[PDB]
Design a protein around this nucleic acid. Structure first.
Lengths: 195, 293, 166, 156, 55
RNA sequence: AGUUCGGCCAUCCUACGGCGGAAACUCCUUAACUCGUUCCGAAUUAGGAAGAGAAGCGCCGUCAGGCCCCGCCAGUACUGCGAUCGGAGACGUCGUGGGAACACGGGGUGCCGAACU
RNA sequence: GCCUGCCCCUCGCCCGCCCCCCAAACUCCGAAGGGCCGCGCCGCCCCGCCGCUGGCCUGGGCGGGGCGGGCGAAUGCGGGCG
RNA sequence: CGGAACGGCGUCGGCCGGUCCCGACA
RNA sequence: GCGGCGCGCCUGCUACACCGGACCGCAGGCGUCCCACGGCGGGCUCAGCGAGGACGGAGACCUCCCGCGGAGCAGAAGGGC
RNA sequence: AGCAGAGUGGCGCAGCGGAAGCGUGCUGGGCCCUCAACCCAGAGGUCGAUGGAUCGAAACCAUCCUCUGCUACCA
């Protein structure tokens, strides 16, 4: 039954993705990575909260799905689906193998998929408005229990999901040096054809 | 209707430009490697190739050896100089080719034997005094002590055809006294059974040009004037064509020495490249025009 | 207004893709030869498809490239079959244009049972002096954008030379 | 390895460079070679005749033979505890001249040039031996503007 | 049943015990594999004048 | 200035828009020949000189793309060598040496010989 | 909307700009780290020899004689062969 | 005090803010 | 034992950038096919975009245009052109 | 564990790169003096879902669900 998962906690093998060589991989449990109002503008949703990872471990797609369902429901119930945009940053690309039950012909057939993470790697990030700003930290704490090891939820200086800090974003927006691209924005980029 | 660009930044990043002279279309490297290669057991002894190049109004004939960073021209002859030797017009014709080939060979053989004054090149290999269109090899006939200067034909991107003008220039050089390896298959008069000397001689001594000039005169006089306006202007008659070449082949043999021709170097107007501030001045002003709208 | 900017027909290609019959293709070759006074060439099939009933390497088409007076003389007859009416969209980005007529009888060929009706597509290529730069073996370089025929420049010259209405 | 054919493990070694695919610059054939010359062997993937094995890539050697279309090179292969001279015949494309002795050749001439002057003007001769850096020296340096630097407080 | 298939440990030590032996001096000058023509010329050239040991 | 043969083979390329030809180069101009075409003087081969800067070409432009160089990135990421260093481990530190890359910001945009006019 | 109309809206489909996360069997870039080789004999003039080489009086080798010279990284240590 | 995710108003030490003599319905 | 054959050989990987590296490790091949699918010379440009042109559309043919190979080169795979 | 097959009308069972097909049920229409047969119509399908793959897939391919047959090495 998917095994204990303490078996596949650490990155002990070189990355094994789905490829021409690796066939018959069971489909990953998590398919929805952009959730919430994933279509909101950069000027909406100013604050960001990130769930970081304190270990170099492999989380399973089963875990990643269990956490996103838990986190989405708490902030949607407490506030609204419209209030936040939650991105599961990690995607399950490694394909774990199980040797069915001796050590002859031990090469295992795929059992599932895991996400290789590192230290400080954000796993779940939420872009939120003020209505849900307080509730986001609790929601990401609910997700922390479904993820193996110790993780930390921190507020982000960067506006939304952009790389501009809230201070840089506010100043650039005032002088019209920011071009909106939808969920995210970039600097005006003075280069290229003038026309 | 919405196309994907063929030339993306990726195509420009992964693109490898070819050799400058291959991008230009001027050089066939595969053919030139074969002409350039000499066995390493022969070391740096110079190897010579006979380049013959036909422009729209010229036949350029050169003997060049390939150094490491350059190509050194041992001797050059151009059909532009044929008026000095008595060929007024038809300077890109088969007869002009032969004349430029003889001039190249004679100019080089003299230039090799200028100070030797004993048993050297031009005296040793006088060539075919009369330009009969017969197969002649300076090599093989007699090569002891001094040997015939050896060169190999470089035709460039020109097609090798029977009765080609590049082959005629080589025939002139062989007739001057230059060892150029040849088989005569791509020469007028070759038959599987055997060469007809007269057929090569006819093209070398005009003939077909003269025959056409007389055919037009016989029938379409208006066309005759249009086709051969310079020939009529220079008073070159159709029967007299063979004679002028015969005098020219003697003239090239007697005095093949190059005489420098004077000219003036005039640059065209040539526009000036702008300074960075000049480029910036235009850009800031162009943006201000957009601001003004 | 350089004389070298003058647009001339480079050539006219008349292709007859009869299909995999073989018998009809020789008869189409005869029809093409009578129109152009030059031997047509036969085009082999690249792949095989049952819907077309062709196997790879079977001769499936017949084409001729006619240049000079014969080109525009033939083109005029083809245009007459469409009453000098052209689609407007028929002009390509590179300035070429095509007709495409059904039947060979209209081009003034006399109907015979041995050669049954054989339609062909007339393609007219519009050139200018100096397009040799892209076709010469030595120093081949692309033509400049200016000297290339715009689709609009093609329509204007054909309206002057053939009085066509779009 | 379970397969050991002539060109095994040569995927990145005998591959051409990013923009350097294509025929050889004609200097490769034109460059003159002399017996005893130092030659660096770098295999070119495009030319397949006379190709040295992947072991011979990266090996400097000397030209034992100068032959038609081919240079024989003596390279030293350490097999076990014995270094063995191996004589290989490599075609022009996969061999290049080496600057191994160029610093020695440059030094010999520079040493003579200083010596030539020592015979004439300025008879005393400077030391013509390489010195391995040496331990600096004294000197007075103006502190004048010295920036006071402090370890910076941790951010993150 | 199963024993070690392969080991390299100690083999470098064993090689360096008295090893890293340079390959002779005659080998560096041998005429094996040299150009048959060049070698014939060398013999003819050294078979004339003081070098000649022909008597 | 321009041609022919070259060297290294984008600071040389690509797109577009300008400009300029006295000569040169080219386009061009015709098939009696010579040669030529899966058909086709398109190319090519021969023979020219009625034209032409319109192109190719040579210069110049463009907050152009690419390419080149230098900063910064960043002493970062990684890593060689010592640690009875820390940590349950995962991994990380500290001494002692090495040290990228992507972005990003700026500036560039062929040069070399032989012959010839 | 209306006989209908593609007289038309909406997402998908194409194209561009972005953007999240990747690859033992992907690489434009590219370390640390390793590998191979060099670190003493020069330069000058003249002379010989060669079925080799070549337009040549060209080379390229193999020698000889003069003319000036000079031992040109650090450290440790006598090496080789049967 | 082999040992984890997780808990601890056990006890010392921090880090970052708010209320603070505008003494933290009157 | 059964079942496989790393029992002779080959490509990419494992393999930790010289070379060398192990496994009943990974993803695969070989025991043949071709007097042309060979040698050589000439000429040529490939896969395709895009736009055009009777039947003709997803799909056959014919044109230009731009095409760094995105095709092909007997078969595995990697180079190479 | 792991292995093979299937999943298609209400029941069956075909199809298998271009429809859904036949029987039964299932009504209707014939047919006769009436009935039985019989004949002929009419209708019946997320083709177990999904993703890919295509101009297009019930089909072909991956994932999965469900059934249904095959299964453990004496010492």
């Amino acid at each position: 039954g998917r095994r204990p998962a303490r078996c596949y906690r650490y990155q002990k093998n070189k990355p094994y993705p789905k490829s021409r060589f690796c066939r018959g991989v069971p489909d990953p449990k998590i398919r929805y990575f952009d959730l919430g109002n994933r279509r909101a503008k950069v000027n909406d949703f100013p604050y960001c909260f990130h769930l970081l990872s304190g270990e170099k471990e492999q989380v399973s797609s089963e875990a990643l799905e269990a956490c996103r369902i838990a986190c989405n429901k708490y902030i949607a119930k407490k506030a609204g689906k419209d209030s936040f945009h939650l991105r599961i940053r990690v995607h399950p690309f490694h394909v774990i193998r199980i040797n069915k039950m001796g050590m002859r012909g031990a090469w295992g057939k795929p059992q599932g998929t895991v996400a290789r993470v590192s230290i400080g790697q954000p796993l779940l990030s939420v872009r939120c408005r003020a209505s849900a700003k307080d509730y986001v930290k609790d929601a990401l704490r609910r997700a922390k229990f479904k993820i193996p090891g110790r993780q930390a939820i921190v507020e982000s200086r960067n506006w939304g999901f952009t790389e501009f800090t809230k201070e840089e974003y506010e100043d650039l927006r005032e002088r019209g040096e920011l071009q909106y691209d939808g969920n995210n924005a970039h600097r005006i980029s003075r280069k290229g054809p003038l026309n | 209707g919405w196309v994907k660009v063929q030339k993306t930044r990726s195509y420009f990043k992964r693109f490898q430009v070819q050799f400058r002279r291959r991008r230009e279309g001027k050089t066939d490297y595969q053919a030139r490697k074969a002409l350039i290669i000499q066995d390493k057991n022969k070391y740096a002894t110079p190897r010579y190739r006979f380049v013959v190049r036909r422009t729209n109004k010229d036949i350029i004939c050169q003997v060049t050896a390939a150094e490491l960073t350059k190509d050194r021209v041992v001797c050059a002859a151009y059909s532009h100089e044929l008026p000095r030797y008595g060929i007024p017009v038809g300077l890109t014709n088969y007869a002009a080719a032969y004349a430029t080939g003889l001039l190249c060979g004679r100019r080089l053989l003299e230039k090799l034997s200028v100070g030797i004054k004993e048993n050297a090149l031009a005296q040793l290999y006088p060539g075919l005094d009369k330009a009969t269109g017969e197969e002649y090899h300076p090599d093989e006939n007699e090569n002891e002590e001094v040997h015939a200067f050896k060169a190999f034909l470089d035709i460039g991107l020109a097609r090798a055809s029977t009765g080609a003008r590049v082959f005629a220039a080589m025939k002139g050089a062989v007739d001057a006294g230059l060892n150029i390896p040849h088989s005569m298959k791509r020469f007028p008069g070759y038959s599987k059974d055997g060469f007809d000397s007269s057929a090569l001689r006819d093209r070398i001594m005009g003939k077909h040009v003269g025959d056409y000039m007389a055919e037009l005169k016989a029938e379409d006089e208006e066309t005759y004037r249009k086709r051969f306006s310079k020939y009529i202007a220079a008073k070159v008659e159709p029967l007299r064509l063979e004679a002028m070449y015969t005098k020219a082949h003697a003239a090239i043999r007697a005095n093949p020495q190059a005489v420098k021709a004077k000219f003036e170097i005039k640059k065209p107007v040539r526009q000036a490249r702008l300074t960075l501030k000049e480029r910036k001045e235009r850009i800031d002003a162009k943006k201000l025009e957009a601001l003004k709208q | 207004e350089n004389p070298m900017r003058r647009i001339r027909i480079e050539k006219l290609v008349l292709n007859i893709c009869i299909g995999g019959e073989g018998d009809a293709l020789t008869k189409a070759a005869k029809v093409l030869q009578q129109l152009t006074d030059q031997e047509p060439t036969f085009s082999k099939s690249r792949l095989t498809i049952r819907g077309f009933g062709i196997r790879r390497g079977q001769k499936i088409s017949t084409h001729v490239t006619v240049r000079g007076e014969k080109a525009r003389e033939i083109i005029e007859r083809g245009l007459r079959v469409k009453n000098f009416e052209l689609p407007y969209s028929c002009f390509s980005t590179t300035g070429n244009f095509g007709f495409g007529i059904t039947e060979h009888i209209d081009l003034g060929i006399k109907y015979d049972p041995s050669m049954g009706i054989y339609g062909m597509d007339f393609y007219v290529v519009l050139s200018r002096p100096g397009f040799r730069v892209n076709k010469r073996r030595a120093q081949q370089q692309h033509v400049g954008a200016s000297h290339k025929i715009t689709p609009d420049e093609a329509r204007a010259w054909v309206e002057r030379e053939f009085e066509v209405v779009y | 390895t379970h397969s050991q054919g002539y060109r095994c493990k040569t995927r990145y070694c005998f591959a051409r460079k990013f923009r350097r695919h294509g025929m050889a610059n004609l200097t490769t054939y034109n460059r003159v070679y002399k017996l005893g010359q130092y030659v660096n062997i770098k295999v070119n993937g495009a030319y397949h005749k006379g190709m040295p094995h992947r072991y011979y890539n990266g090996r400097t050697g000397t030209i034992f033979n100068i032959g038609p279309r081919a240079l024989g090179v003596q390279i030293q292969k350490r097999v076990r505890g014995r270094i063995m001279l191996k004589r290989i015949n490599v075609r022009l494309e996969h061999v290049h001249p080496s600057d191994c002795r160029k610093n020695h050749l440059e030094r010999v001439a520079a040493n003579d040039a200083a010596r030539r002057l020592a015979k004439e003007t300025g008879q005393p001769v400077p030391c013509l031996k390489r010195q391995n850096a040496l331990p600096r020296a004294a000197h007075v340096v103006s502190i004048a503007s010295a920036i006071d630097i402090t370890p910076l407080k941790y951010d993150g | 049943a199963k024993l070690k298939n392969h080991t390299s440990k100690n083999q470098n030590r064993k090689d360096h015990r008295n090893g890293i032996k340079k390959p002779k001096k005659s080998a560096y000058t041998s005429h094996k594999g040299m150009c048959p023509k060049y070698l014939r010329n060398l013999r003819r050239s050294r078979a004339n004048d003081p070098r000649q040991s022909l008597r």
